[PDB]
Each structure stands twice: as structure tokens, then as C-alpha cells.
Symmetry: D2
Subunit: 104 residues, 4 copies
Amino acid sequence: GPHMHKKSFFDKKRSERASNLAGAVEFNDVKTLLREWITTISDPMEEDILQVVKYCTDLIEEKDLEKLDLVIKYMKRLMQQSVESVWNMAFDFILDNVQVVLQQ
Amino acid sequence: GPHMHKKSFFDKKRSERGSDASNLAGAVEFNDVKTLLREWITTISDPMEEDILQVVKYCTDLIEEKDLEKLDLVIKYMKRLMQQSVESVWNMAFDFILDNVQVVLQQ
Amino acid sequence: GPHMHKKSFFDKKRSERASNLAGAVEFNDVKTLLREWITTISDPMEEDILQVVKYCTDLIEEKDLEKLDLVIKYMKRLMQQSVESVWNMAFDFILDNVQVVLQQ
Amino acid sequence: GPHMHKKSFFDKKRSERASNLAGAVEFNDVKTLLREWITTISDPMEEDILQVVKYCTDLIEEKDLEKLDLVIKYMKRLMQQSVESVWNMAFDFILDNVQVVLQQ
Ligand SMILES: [Mg+2]
Ligand SMILES: [Mg+2]
Ligand SMILES: [Mg+2]
Ligand SMILES: [Mg+2]
Ligand SMILES: [Mg+2]
Ligand code: NI
Ligand code: NI
Ligand code: NI
Ligand code: NI
Ligand code: NI
Ligand code: NI
């Protein structure tokens, strides 16, 4: 019967190419991915949001809090700039779930 | 680990009433149907695939019982409310509902 | 492209008809639904498993721990009787998630 | 509230590493992945089943019908050998969806 296709952006980008987001390790590569994600996709997928949360918590795990601050500040800018409420809510979720691991 | 909760609007509403024949979350009559519709587009910021597909089924069930008259109203109502949203997710949800309904109508 | 349909058993049963499972309030009605679910369906759906967990936590909420014990003991029997690992795992998940709410 | 985690096996294996299954191109690599998937996982995920269907259709796309026959014959053996009905049904779905693309 009728169906919708939920395509993971980060799965595609990883398929096209140690804390990494869709394979990207360096901050300039990571911000290129996040820019393409936020500006190209209209509805962020749960999988992709959770893949970003894992990247951030992996940064916390390897104590690279410098990169984490850059990643969060960049996402804050782009996602809060968005006219779409889904991207505003996606940021709150990412932030709230990162804060929890930081506060441990 | 971290998680998101995808709650079905029409499942909730069917639990609150529920059922009375073609229905949307239990609602059979147009005036109770446009009401469940009314409440969905207006409250929910991100529509769920389940709810979108529950609407498509209702519409195709109308086509099935040849109630093309009620179907005209149901689509005409959603065409009104969904197209007039600022959120792209609701614009895309309408295209999907329409495109899938048109296919069955065009048969 | 190709796709799979996840069909909710409890949604169907509710459609065909204050703590309730697919509309059923009385224990004899609830055990009839659970019997039909476990003995009729080959692969339990996440939605249906979570709909059972909600019913069980709603019982805890209205302090009807008598009904809850009957519901769990009945599901233990039927789901552990199953040859299919999916039904065995579905029970563990329901039990583990009910214990959490009981322990609160 | 209560939740289930659907972890993609092939996403994990691709993350740990032109037609490929989770990065694996050569048949011995592909059969190693399929063996670990079928023998390690109790309930196959929709995403992973659809990732296998995409690999087979990608083989059809590059006209490598030799590799496709090896992949299907191997999956037939392992998935039909399984005690779990979910794996028997997963094979039928993969085969039926491959036949559709072959019939085009
Ligand atoms: Mg917040
Ligand atoms: Mg269209
Ligand atoms: Mg346990
Ligand atoms: Mg399953
Ligand atoms: Mg077949
Ligand atoms: Ni279908
Ligand atoms: Ni979790
Ligand atoms: Ni439902
Ligand atoms: Ni499709
Ligand atoms: Ni939760
Ligand atoms: Ni994935």
C-alpha cells in the first residue's frame, strides 16, 4: 500500500566517502555536512538527529570539548536561523541530550 | 540511549471518543471528521507518517464506497488548512495525500 | 522504492469495536485480545508492544496492581510458550519496562 | 517514555570499515557480513533488509548477475536454515523485491 521513504542524510554521505560524523573527522568537513543537512533537508530524520547526538557524545568521550563547542555553536546559528519549527525543535533535542552527558 | 517519541494523533483521538463504514479516527460524519482534521494540522508541528497514511486510507475508503461527495469535502477542507501553513512539512504532507488520492481517482 | 508495512494489531481491533487495551477494559476481554495477538501474529510490531506497555503503566497509575499481575502472568505463559524469539524478546521488553514503573 | 532501539547492523559494520553492502564489494566480504547478520541478530531490522535489497538492485544496475546469483543462493541457504520465521519471511521479501527489478 502507500508508503513514505525516510532517507538518512548522514548514511548517504558516509556511503559517498576517531570521533566522526558520517565519516568526517575535521571540523571544516563536519560543518560542511551540517550546512548541507540543515539547508538542503526540509524535515530532519530521527536517525540523523540521533547520529549527530552520538557524534557529540563521542566528542565528550574523547574529552575534545573544544570541537564540541564549535559543533554546538555552529548548529545553534544554522538551526535557530531556520524558519522551520522542526529544525528549531531538532536543535533543542540535540542540545538538551548533550547537556545531560556534560552535566554527568 | 537518547530517543524521540513519535505519537499518533489519530490513534489518541480514536482512544478518546471513539468509533461509530468509512471513518477517520472513528469519525464517520463529515462534521466530526473535519473536527479531528481541524485539531491535527493546527496543533502538531511535525506530522507523523502513520497519521498521514491513516488520512490517505480514509480518503481511499471513501473512493471505495463511491462517497466521492464526502471525499470532495475532506480534500477541499485539507487543501484549505494544509496549503495555508508556514511549515514545509505540512505542505509536503498535503502533496503526498493528494498525489496518492489522485492515483486512485485517475484509475 | 521497495518498502515494508508495519501493521498494528491493536489499532485494527480498536477500529473493529479507564485503563484499556485496544478499548478492552475487563480482564476477560483483555486476555482474549492478548491471546489473539500472540497466537495469530507471527512478528509483533513495536507499536503494539508499546501499546501493551502503556496499558500496563496505566494500570499502575490507577493502582490496580491486581489486574496488572494477572495481565503479566498471562503474557508470561503465552509469550514464553512461543518458538519465535521475537515473542520471547517482546515479553522481556514489556516486563523490564513495567518493573521500572513499579520500582518508582 | 519507554522506547526500543532499532540499531542498523549494516550501518555499524560500514562505520567500522562500485556495488557494495555496508562497504563490502568482494563476494567473500559480503558473505562474511551476511553470515554475521543472519547468525548474530535475532530480529532483522527493516532498514538492514532494505539495505540488502538496495545492494542486489545495485548489482542488477551494474549488470553483475553472476554476483547477484551467488548473493541470493547464499542468503537462501542461511535464511531458510534459520529456526526463526522472521528470517524466513525476510528472505521471501528480499527475493520477491529482487524479482520485480529483474522483471523490469
Ligand atoms: Mg532546551
Ligand atoms: Mg507531487
Ligand atoms: Mg529482563
Ligand atoms: Mg520486527
Ligand atoms: Mg517468494
Ligand atoms: Ni505498499
Ligand atoms: Ni535509550
Ligand atoms: Ni497506531
Ligand atoms: Ni517506494
Ligand atoms: Ni521516552
Ligand atoms: Ni542508517
